[PDB]
């Protein structure tokens, strides 16, 4: 792999994933051993090496993986090696990747302060695992509970030190020294930053405006934290949450009128059906929020090969139904409703998506003269009048739950008269039909 | 048979399988950790423990013949209902809740019934049947927010049962932040233990503290976990809880808001305080008669079929008054109302003046409309709701006096709500009824020539 | 009748009638439970009472004399009033509120107060209070504050009281979990015990704790129930607050919202810095003449008539300034305010350059304007107010060269807040006033032959 | 000279201004109450109060120099200025603020700043720049948070300062609430009493607690008030973080939300892989080069002129490569770029099609093309940044072989971020200048020969 591309190529995404475990190393656990005197002579040792470790997963990434970045000049993926390496000199990433990995030799695991300027691989990965990982909402929860976790992490680490400075078991508020040191000062940092209180009151001077200190930045930073975490988890239910708004407006405005409850179960029985259908409610929203070359390509995949399997759609224009899909719009009905009526006027041509309706003619009605299922135009006939001159022939009754398109009337005709050959050919197969 | 999820009967079993799982998700846990809940009504407890297993059997039914769409459809063929309940996740949930484990009474002893958390793998049933209350139901946010609040005493309660468990496991009245000893009278008592445990789960899920500190790395581990799922679980839930209560207050509050920007407004451009009155006198009638939900917002999602369904039985007595609608053929009406848009005006109102262009024609909802002079002191004929007006400068009448407008002064008194019918709304609905055109115009030519 | 319940008197009666209600919802809770308040002011209380039983019977006779809406139109007729009043909800919960409890006095004593309690079944005569003085009062989000400060007032009020009562009802000075000993002379003032309840109450409704931890269970069971009162009902009253407060300037954070975004945009576009000084320098004029917020969104929510009517109102000096209309009729302005579009220019700007697409007559409010010269060193004509410019391109007359482009270049000398005319919007406008057409004709021509 | 509001030495003068007001608003409660700090720094003190008070009297000599707009136009006359200044509320805050009440330090005593309380009335100096330093940073977010926090900070100082001396009334270590004895050499200590005092204040404003209890009746309403004012301040808190939280996210959690729905949409319905990675990669390339922000929706709130400057500022670089544009006349440029729409297309998808009717036409901004034919494995020439394709068909053209149809196909060989013209939208804006059409008809032409 001389060039990857950042956004795919998924073994990128595991290495930035590494580099994220080793900048997530140095962020929890400088704040450790600068504080907790657990880097003690006995394991100096252990504790360098998974150092170096870090250091080496800095360097293959300032090195091997950023240099082989391919990135877009002139609006062209630029593959070359040179200039692969050039652009990443250029770029702000080679200022925080040097300005990370700054020669400490000089021990002081302060020294390694600026291993946390990498960041920037931190939100990359971020941006990755939140693009290439389907229903991402529960990593977010997990990276704001993170930064929740590092805030307390930080905190019981500043009390130790503050702890260590006081004389460590000098007083009832810094840390007595027995028990763990980091489980002890971490529960301080929960009860300081959360606000809960139920701490031993600090007695001297340093350790009042600590406490101080330490009560403002647990009521600002606590607070971000955790509406950052609703904001998430509230994105996370917003269709949902959105639908049922909707749902419950649309309950309380038939329940205003005293709309019987037959109507009423129809409506929330539509409401069920779109959701478990469609999932978004209406999908113009979303259509319109997109380009004009992306709404084609997400209705040339989904509903194009049905549209085209139609024994009315064969032998036109291939461009047409290109120009089909821009003004299809998905509805749909429920079980036993009248899509079409006989001796209503007819503004709308019907092809079923996923569904069967029923044509119903003959003696005094209700006979299925034929049943038509996913992939079939019906109430085309009626379209081609003017001044709606043709009623209905038939009326149509949908058997189930039918999910269907709808072109209504003069608006296929604004773009049948783009297409001669086309119109004549559909002229011909509605003469057929009746 | 076949059940169908839509029916009745579907919900009633939902209830009724929801009620054991919910015994299931409280009485296992507390139980299992207060031994003295389970040793001192062994007897019910069993009871209700075999009343549970019976329904989960009953539910086994159920599931293999309850309905499932396919294709819009609702089949009712029973191997298909059993393959595809087999092939789900649910069943395999189900079989894993249902696997005899009650034989481990032996094994363990009778004193830990903690072998039965399978049995909670029916939360999907609790879950479905909440969901599909909260459709049906008249009041959905009210029950959203019990829902909450009773999923905030389901993880109190289990958090309760595990820090009882906890203090059994380090021993009771070894440690100043663990329960109590026993072999004390007062803590003794199994509604203390179950009490003090809930208080303690209270609080610190609720973040209060003000318990015994930790005087053990296990407790201080607990502690800061149990912190920390008060912070991240409950505060979300106690947060959701204060949202769905903003959002029964969400349509008033949005009203409120643009009546508070409507005065600010008006405040800064020094109004007199007359129009100010009005203003506000409009407002309180709009909240007073609770006009303020509008129509085309609230049903912007609802397809064509059913919002004609809809504004039908919203407008039953207007549309059987009206002498263009339900009259002779009612065939119209469930094309036009979607076009009809429901305006309300003030006393005093001047709807259409004479000389006026008219680009659309009044149907009379509610209210008493009248026709005046130049001057409008005096009124010729008032009009009652269900009528209609401003129709003359709307479609082309054969030898029309003025031609495209009005002829005559339109006074409303009191506050009258009357739909509105724009020109090319009409039109689209004439062309396709020449008869309907003809009616209105024999009246327009009678009424024209004086 | 008839009160008139839109009018200002029966809102002036609204404030007279809700502080019974408030005194009935703060003080007879307080004396049920605090005894020695009771006993101590038993005078007062007694004349307070009889007041509020005098204001609430008073309330009973205007609610029979207030005048609903049928048909839109006020009911005049009493026996109708009185007959709609009796069938309502409201006239069950006032007669239930007005039930002769106190006649219980001779067979409960004197120290029981709460069989008045359902005194406080007129709770909806406050909310409506509190509901029309939040749509009239000039400061909505300060007494909506207020409001819900009352609100918390009031839970807290009647939690202290409901604290004292189970300490009344388990004994005082029994536990240290319970108010102390009567017997002290410290403990025993009604002032501390008032006083020591409302901090016990906003302790536990706060989440503070920072109280002696229960002892019997019921203690435990009510410090659990009232910990979850605070953690649900008392903070999402807080947090709505919080919310409100937040956004209290909802225009001031939009229109701050939009700065953030433009300025986003500009900084990763690269745009120089004498161009983000001029956008910096447009907002500032924006926000210091507060014409920040668009007339037409605020407004859109209100009928078109009473839109007109605003309109009119506050544009009423300027548009009589102009030379088309409001010479001799002055009846023009009413029907074209609502085609006219509010626009406000930077300085040095050219509004009309020379030889442009003419689309609005570019009616002005404020501003001084020059007509300027092609090379823009010289100016000929200071257009200052009422003055429009714009009157060859939008209709064309004859025996015009070069009709549908500008005749001159305009140049906005200062910052000119005026107000731009569409083209087909006022060409529909201008065919029904035959003076119009007359006087823009002739103007057009007469400064086209210069 | 006099001076501009909108200037930046008026900016200056309001930051300086700003420095003594945030000094008095600190301060002079601070020595009020801790008289330890008034006593001590007595020469620190009076030199600084000299000199707010001489910044104070520059700032009103300021005030008569600021020019207001009148007609749009910056007042410069002096007298003006004054008159209009002396007639404001802002005059009488300013006067009141100058009262010389520094001269009762003789009659009072030189421990007394409670009588220049009246400094803070010029508030008004520190809200305006605060006002104004938000629109004008370029980091309104953070300047918000700190904004915030130092209102916060001056909150809690006086709540500190307030709680000492309510102590200092009551008595020192007359109780367990109160500040201990200042005669204690530990107590005694004014860093050790503020910090204590201010640790005290966010104990008690921000809800935690952890203080002694109060004593006596004043004491306990003292802190059940100051409970209520410190929640109601941390509700505010909560609500402004979470205000800052969604405007911060607004860029951010906008794209995120539209990215999570077209992903559940794309799953849901079940695309193929190989589009939903198409659709992914186009949606990161967006994000990568921040081209996601909408041009339309954030460029709609400024005038036509400054949004034609934005646009053209923006697309300086690409429009003189443009034929069509700045290089015949360039004087269809500023009405062209606002009628135009900015897309941006994946590497090879086929942005036009042979046998397809076009309706818009394309000017590549930073992108490359190919045109290639047939099958699209060959192709003719790349088109640079800069140049304009596709108008064959839109033009109707007497002599085209192929009617309102493309010619060829086109293919982008990179990400390709070009400009398009509707057919409709350029059909206007050509037809009016006369030589537009000759040179894109002759173009036409010569692309037919080819
Ligand atoms: N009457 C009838 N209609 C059919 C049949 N097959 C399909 N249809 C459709 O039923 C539709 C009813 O409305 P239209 O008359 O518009 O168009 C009709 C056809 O599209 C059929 O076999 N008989
Ligand atoms: N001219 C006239 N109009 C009437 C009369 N009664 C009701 N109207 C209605 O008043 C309306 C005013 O506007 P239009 O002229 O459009 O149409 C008019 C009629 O619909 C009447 O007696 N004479
Ligand atoms: N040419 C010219 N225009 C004037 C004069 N006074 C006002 N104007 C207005 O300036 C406007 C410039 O644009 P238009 O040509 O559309 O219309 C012009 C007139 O409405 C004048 O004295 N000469
Ligand atoms: N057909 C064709 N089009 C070309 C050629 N070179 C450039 N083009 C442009 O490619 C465009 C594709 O869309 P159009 O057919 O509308 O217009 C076409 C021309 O503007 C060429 O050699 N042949």
């Known amino acids: ?434 | 048979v076949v059940i169908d999820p839509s029916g009745n009967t579907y919900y009633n079993w939902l209830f009724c399988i929801t009620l054991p799982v919910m015994y299931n998700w409280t009485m296992v846990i507390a139980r299992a950790c207060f031994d003295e809940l389970q040793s001192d009504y062994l007897e019910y407890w069993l009871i209700l423990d075999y009343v549970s297993d019976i329904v989960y059997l009953i539910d086994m039914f159920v599931r293999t013949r309850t309905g499932y769409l396919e294709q819009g459809l609702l089949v009712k063929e029973e191997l298909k209902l059993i393959n595809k309940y087999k092939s789900n996740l649910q069943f395999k949930l189900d079989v894993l809740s249902l696997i005899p484990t009650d034989l481990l009474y032996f094994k363990l002893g009778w004193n830990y019934p903690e072998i039965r958390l399978n049995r909670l793998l029916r939360f999907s049933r609790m879950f479905e049947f909440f969901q599909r209350t909260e459709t049906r139901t008249n009041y959905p946010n009210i029950f959203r927010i019990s829902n909450l609040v009773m999923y905030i005493v389901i993880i109190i309660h289990w958090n309760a049962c595990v820090f009882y468990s906890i203090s059994k496991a380090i021993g009771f009245g070894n440690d100043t932040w663990v329960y109590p000893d026993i072999n004390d009278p007062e803590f003794g008592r199994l509604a203390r233990k179950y009490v003090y445990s809930l208080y303690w789960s209270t609080l610190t899920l609720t973040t209060i503290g003000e318990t015994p500190p930790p005087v053990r790395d296990s407790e201080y581990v607990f502690v800061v976990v149990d912190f920390l799922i008060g912070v991240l679980i409950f505060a979300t839930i106690v947060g959701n809880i204060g949202s769905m209560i903003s959002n029964m207050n969400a349509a008033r509050a949005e009203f409120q808001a643009r009546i508070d920007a409507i005065k600010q407004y008006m405040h800064f451009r020094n109004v007199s305080k007359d129009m100010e009155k009005r203003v506000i006198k409009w407002f309180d009638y709009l909240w007073t008669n609770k006009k303020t939900v509008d129509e085309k917002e609230v049903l912007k999602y609802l397809p064509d079929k059913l919002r004609a369904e809809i504004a039908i039985n919203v407008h039953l007595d207007t549309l059987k008054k009206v002498r263009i609608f339900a009259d002779c053929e009612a065939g119209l009406l469930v094309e036009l109302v979607l076009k009809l848009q429901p305006q309300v005006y003030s006393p005093g109102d001047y709807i259409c003046k004479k000389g006026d262009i008219g680009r659309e024609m009044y149907i009379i909802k509610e209210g008493k409309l009248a026709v005046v002079a130049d001057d409008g002191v005096t009124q010729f004929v008032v009009l009652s709701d269900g009528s209609y007006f401003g129709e003359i400068s709307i479609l082309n009448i054969k030898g029309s006096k003025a031609g495209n407008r009005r002829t005559a002064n339109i006074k409303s008194i009191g506050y009258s709500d009357l739909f509105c019918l724009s020109k090319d709304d009409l039109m689209e609905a004439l062309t396709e009824y020449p008869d309907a055109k003809t009616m209105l115009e024999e009246k327009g030519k009678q009424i024209l020539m004086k």
């Not at chain 1, 925080?96 to 020669?103: A, N, R, T, V």
Request: charge should be positive.
């Open chain 1, 1 to 434: 792999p001389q060039s990857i591309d950042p956004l795919t190529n998924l073994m990128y995404v595991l290495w930035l994933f590494f580099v994220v475990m080793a900048w997530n190393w140095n962020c929890w656990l400088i704040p450790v051993r600068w504080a907790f005197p657990y880097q003690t002579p006995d394991n100096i040792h252990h504790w360098l090496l998974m150092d170096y470790l870090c250091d080496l997963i800095y360097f293959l990434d300032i090195t091997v993986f950023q240099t082989r970045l391919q990135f877009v000049r002139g609006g062209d993926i630029i593959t070359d090696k040179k200039d692969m390496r050039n652009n990443y000199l250029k770029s702000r990433r080679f200022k925080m990747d040097l300005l990370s990995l700054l020669p400490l030799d000089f021990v002081n695991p302060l020294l390694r302060l600026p291993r946390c300027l990498k960041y920037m691989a931190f939100f990359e990965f971020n941006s990755r695992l939140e693009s290439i990982l389907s229903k991402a909402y529960v990593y977010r929860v997990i990276r704001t509970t993170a930064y929740l976790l590092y805030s307390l992490h930080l905190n019981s680490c500043l009390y130790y030190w503050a702890s260590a400075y006081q004389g460590l078991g000098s007083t009832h508020w810094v840390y007595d020294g027995v028990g763990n040191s980091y489980i002890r000062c971490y529960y301080f940092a929960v009860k300081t930053l959360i606000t809960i209180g139920g701490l031993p009151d600090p007695k001297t001077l340093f350790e009042i405006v600590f406490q101080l200190l330490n009560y403002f930045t647990g009521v600002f930073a606590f607070s971000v934290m955790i509406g950052q975490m609703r904001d998430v988890v509230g994105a996370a239910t917003a269709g949902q949450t959105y639908y049922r708004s909707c749902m419950d407006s649309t309950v309380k405005y038939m329940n205003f009128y005293k709309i019987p409850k037959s109507v009423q179960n129809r409506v929330k029985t539509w409401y069920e059906y779109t959701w478990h259908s469609q999932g978004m409610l209406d999908e113009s929203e979303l259509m319109v929020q997109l380009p004009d070359k992306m709404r084609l390509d997400l209705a040339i995949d989904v509903n194009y090969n049905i549209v085209s399997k139609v024994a009315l759609f064969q032998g036109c224009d291939r461009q047409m139904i290109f120009d089909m899909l821009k003004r299809l719009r998905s509805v749909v009905y429920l079980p036993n409703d009248y899509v079409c009526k006989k001796g209503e006027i007819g503004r709308e041509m019907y092809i079923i998506q996923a569904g069967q309706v029923q044509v119903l003619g003959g003696p005094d009605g209700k006979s299925v003269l034929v049943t038509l299922k996913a992939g079939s135009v019906f109430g085309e006939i009626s379209l081609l009048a003017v001044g709606g001159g043709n009623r209905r022939t038939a009326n149509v009754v949908a058997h189930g739950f039918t999910n269907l398109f709808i072109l209504d009337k003069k608006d296929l005709n604004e773009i049948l008269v783009h297409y001669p050959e086309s119109q004549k050919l559909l002229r011909k197969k509605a003469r057929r039909m009746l």
